[PDB]
């Protein structure tokens, strides 16, 4: 029986890979995506109000084998307190914010959700995804009303107001107006050459950003019934950034009725522009007319100049918001007469609040002011190393630019230290000190209580300190670096000139031929395993530095080395997707495991056992039994490649930090894992149904004729149409025609043979009713001839024996209509034959000698 491992936490991510929706205060609250879950952040306090999680924790028994789908879009409706979350698989979930439960679940999209938009009533939700479809969902019935599928690439943006018209812009460079009455595209224009990334519509103004710096301005005239008049290209203007712009959004001041919009960019900039008022635009037009009169240009030339500059008349560049990080999403949060305020969630895991003070013409301050920031409870750059303290009560995550000490139990950041490019970190005994190794070769020692660096050794190594380890007492340190050396440091306390301060002094150096990637000291301090770029790992006795063994058999360099507690077993995991388990008594290899589809970055034995965790670039954490060399549990909660792994001394929990800026804890649980009808019969039933309907309709028409002639008595009631005919929307003539077409050529003779004589008479009635219709008769003329002639030949004697004046009249009508149609086709063929022969004869006569 092996204990189950389940995820118990996920902290370290603020906003990641989806747009942020602002929730106004009762600066308000911001809803952001945190990978598989949703965060709500209070801006003024910088605290997480609530977290919405989908269901069962990953790594559980009922969890799916694939990685969870990240939240790819958010759209909140304030009237009903609802929020639509669009995940990466295509799942749209509707959470009521008060109850935090999934009210509605839709799965209509094969790819990631790109944009969601509620209608004003809150009853329909419009969803555009990567699979080039726009789907409208009815929240009342939890169904998909209709799907819009003429786009050749992913829907970048759309706009829908009213139940009549929609406008969509996609990555194929193309914009379409959609009539929702017929679910069909009315007008299709090419917006930009490569892609059409951003769309925003304001009254009769439509703004689209594509792949280039230029932005296109369009007039929307829906009521124009002429084809091509719905969308018109007025002019182009150029924003400064050469990067393409994902999101455009308008907002209007309530009092002054002015409108400002913003164009996001892929870069760090967001460009806010202002539309001038109608009177201001008229005054500018008058000023340009005066300028053209002063210039003396022709009126047609002045008209061309006005058409060229008309893009510059509506818009003026108001300001540009710049941030330290690449921007993922933004939102106009509020507008007053004094300021314009904007919230932006960046690429490197921050939320920033910006304010722009203005006086209706130009902004007062040269740059927008960053008021509030939510950057405390997260990491800016991916975690390269983690360490759980000796008490298992604290965690330390070291990355490029920051070392943060977290409380595991309360899931937040106790302390934050500034540092360099941190490749490896470790705890000194007692949990009071953290030791770091930087890519510059520097070695920094942080103190938790004093909250500052105690000792920094700048020239600890010439090249990057790739790995670092302490002995069991912590008195000695072994640093392995890319300068092809391994240096031993000793910690000793010196009294101040009088508190003792720890100091690290360099004792010994071992110069190897190549780079040292990983270094591990065994728990009993007898063995020192040193990886190399020669794809080999050496093992030294820690006492006397005697060279014991060299373990080889790895194609690519060994990235992680780990030693069991009894020091009988060592594990090397390398970049050739292999975990090799060696015995340290002699150096034989017990096992080689092809574990992941990409490199295994880290491997950690559990304390007091030979089971071990593996941590790889496949974004999978795999728990392994080293007793029978088999994988126990597979953990899939991580989205992208996972860098660091640490195990508690009790073995209760295993912490993993990945590229997706998320730190997760895997805890032991109480549960335990253990390692029909024949052809012809359809014709008779179709004849029964159709001839019954035809005879009923004819009797009803005769009853109406008689009642209208009499002009007295009750009017007869029209018989109800047959349910199959109404459902399929087919006249009985077309229904029996389709049954004849469904009957194959081989079975046809047996079908017509097996029908009895009453069905033969019904067939003749059907044929007469078809003769009444000239389109269907000419569409299926040879089939009708073949079937009717075979029926008459097979049943000639009985049909002759029948003495019915109605049957004689039916045969006369059928004969006349058959011969009329057949001789019409015959006349066409003969005329064409003689004409084409004449044409060929004339050409031969002209070009003959």
């Amino acid at each position: 029986s092996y204990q189950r491992f389940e995820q118990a936490a996920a902290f370290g991510v603020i906003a990641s890979n989806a747009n942020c929706v602002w929730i106004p205060a009762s600066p308000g609250q911001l809803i952001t995506s945190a990978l598989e879950d949703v965060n709500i952040w209070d801006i003024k306090t910088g605290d997480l109000v609530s977290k919405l999680s989908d269901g069962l924790p990953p790594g559980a028994s009922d969890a799916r084998g694939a990685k969870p789908a990240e939240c790819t879009y958010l759209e909140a409706h304030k009237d009903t307190d609802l929020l639509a979350v669009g995940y990466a698989d295509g799942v749209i979930k509707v959470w009521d914010l008060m109850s935090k439960t999934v009210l509605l679940n839709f799965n209509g999209h094969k790819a990631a959700i790109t944009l969601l938009q509620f209608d004003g009533t809150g009853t329909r939700l419009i969803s555009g995804s990567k699979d080039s479809n726009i789907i409208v969902w009815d929240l009342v019935g939890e169904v998909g009303l209709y799907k819009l599928r003429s786009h050749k690439d992913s829907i970048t943006g759309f706009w829908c107001q009213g139940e009549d018209w929609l406008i969509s812009t996609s990555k194929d460079g193309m914009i379409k107006l959609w009539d929702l009455k017929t679910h069909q595209c009315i007008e299709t224009h090419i917006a930009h050459t490569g892609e059409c990334w951003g769309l925003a519509v304001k009254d009769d103004l439509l703004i689209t950003t594509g792949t280039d710096s230029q932005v296109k301005i369009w007039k929307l005239d829906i009521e124009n019934d002429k084809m091509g008049g719905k969308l018109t290209e007025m002019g182009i203007f150029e924003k400064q950034s050469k990067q393409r712009g994902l999101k455009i959004e308008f907002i209007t001041n309530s009092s002054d009725k002015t409108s400002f919009f913003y164009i996001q960019n892929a870069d760090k900039t967001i460009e806010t522009f202002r539309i001038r008022k109608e009177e201001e635009i008229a005054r500018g037009l008058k000023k340009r007319e005066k300028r053209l009169k002063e210039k003396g240009l022709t009126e047609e030339e002045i008209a061309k100049s006005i058409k060229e500059s008309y893009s510059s008349f509506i818009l003026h560049p108001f300001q540009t918001i710049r941030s330290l990080y690449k921007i993922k999403s933004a939102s106009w949060t509020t507008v007053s007469s004094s300021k314009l305020e904007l919230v932006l969630t960046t690429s490197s895991n921050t939320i920033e609040y910006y304010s722009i003070p203005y006086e209706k013409r130009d902004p007062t301050s040269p740059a927008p002011l960053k008021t509030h920031t939510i950057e405390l409870q997260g990491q800016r750059t991916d975690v390269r190393s983690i360490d759980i303290s000796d008490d298992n009560k604290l965690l330390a995550t070291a990355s490029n630019g920051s070392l943060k000490i977290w409380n595991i139990k309360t899931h937040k950041c106790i302390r934050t230290f500034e540092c360099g490019y941190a490749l490896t970190c470790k705890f000194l005994p007692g949990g009071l000190l953290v030791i770091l190794g930087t890519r510059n070769g520097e070695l920094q020692l942080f103190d938790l209580a004093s909250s500052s660096l105690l000792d920094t050794i700048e020239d600890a190594h010439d090249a990057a300190i790739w790995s670092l380890d302490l002995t069991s007492d912590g008195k000695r340190l072994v640093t392995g670096s890319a300068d092809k050396t391994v240096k031993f440091w000793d910690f000793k306390v010196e009294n101040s000139l009088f508190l003792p301060v720890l100091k690290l002094h360099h004792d010994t150096t071992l110069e190897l031929t190549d780079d040292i990637l990983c270094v591990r000291v065994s728990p009993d301090d007898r063995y020192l395993a040193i990886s190399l770029l020669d794809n080999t790992v050496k093992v030294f006795f820690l006492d006397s530095m005697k060279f014991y063994l060299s373990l080889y058999g790895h194609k690519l360099p060994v990235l992680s080395i780990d030693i069991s507690f009894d020091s009988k077993m060592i594990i090397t995991s390398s970049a050739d997707k292999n975990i090799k388990i060696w015995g340290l008594d002699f150096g034989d290899c017990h096992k080689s495991l092809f574990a992941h589809q990409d490199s295994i970055m880290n491997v950690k034995f559990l304390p007091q056992s030979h089971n071990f965790f593996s941590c790889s670039k496949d974004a999978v954490v795999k728990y392994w039994d080293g007793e029978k060399f088999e994988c126990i549990q597979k953990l899939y909660a991580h989205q992208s490649e996972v860098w660091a792994l640490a195990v508690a001394t009790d073995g209760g929990f295993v912490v993993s930090s990945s590229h997706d800026h998320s730190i997760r804890i895997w805890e032991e649980t109480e549960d335990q894992v253990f390692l029909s009808l024949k052809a012809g019969e359809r014709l008779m039933e179709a004849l029964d149904l159709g001839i019954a309907e035809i005879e009923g309709l004819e009797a009803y028409n005769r009853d109406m004729k008689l009642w209208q002639r009499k002009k007295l008595g009750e009017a007869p009631i029209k018989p109800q149409g047959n349910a199959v005919l109404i459902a399929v929307n087919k006249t009985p003539e077309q229904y029996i025609m389709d049954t004849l077409l469904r009957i194959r050529m081989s079975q046809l003779e047996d079908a017509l043979m097996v029908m009895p004589f009453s069905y033969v008479l019904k067939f003749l009635k059907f044929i007469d009713t078809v003769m009444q219709n000239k389109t269907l008769l000419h569409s299926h003329l040879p089939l009708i001839c073949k079937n009717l002639f075979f029926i008459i030949k097979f049943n000639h004697k009985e049909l002759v024996s029948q003495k019915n004046e109605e049957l004689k009249l039916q045969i006369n009508r059928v004969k006349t209509e058959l011969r009329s149609a057949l001789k019409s086709t015959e006349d066409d063929l003969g005329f064409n034959v003689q004409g084409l022969k004449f044409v060929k004869q004339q050409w031969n006569l002209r070009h003959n000698y």
Binding site: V800, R819, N832, V833
Partner: protein
């Protein structure tokens, strides 16, 4: 530069033509759909327009009158394209009715002399003729078989 702008204008005009043809075939307008189909070279759209125009033609004009007038308008390269289409449809027995109807419209509304000195026309005509003769033989045989109804009526009359 200018050539790239001309290519972009051609691409935009192609997109507008495709959308206009789709709207036309959605709402009827068989003459406009036929003209755009011939300019865009879409044989399925062309065949559907012609066959459904013949559909309302069943209910002297071969098709709808303005469609016939358009076929009279067509130049020699569109004539060659249309006669290739009619030749291929004539190879099939089901789709030969539309081909015969269109060839008859061309013959009635065009000049036979210019039809002769159109280059490559007589190869198409020589391809069309034997299939028309086979179809004429088959339809003539059907008219012959249709007299079983006369025989039935004669026997029914002499019985009663």
């Amino acid at each position: 530069e200018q050539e790239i702008e001309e290519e972009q204008e051609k691409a935009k005009l192609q997109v507008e033509q495709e959308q206009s043809l789709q709207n036309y075939m959605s709402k009827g307008d068989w003459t406009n759909a036929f003209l755009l189909a011939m300019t865009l070279d879409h044989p399925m759209r062309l065949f559907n327009v012609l066959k459904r125009a013949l559909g309302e033609s069943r209910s002297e004009v071969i098709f709808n009158e303005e469609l016939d007038q358009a076929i009279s308008i067509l130049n020699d390269e569109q004539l060659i394209l249309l006669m290739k289409r009619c030749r291929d449809w004539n190879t099939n027995a089901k789709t030969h009715t539309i081909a015969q109807r269109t060839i008859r419209c061309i013959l009635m509304h065009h000049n036979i002399a210019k039809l002769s000195e159109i280059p490559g026309m007589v190869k198409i005509v020589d391809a069309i003729i034997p299939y028309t003769q086979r179809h004429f033989t088959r339809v003539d045989n059907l008219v012959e078989q249709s007299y079983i109804l006369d025989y039935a009526l004669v026997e029914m009359d002499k019985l009663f």
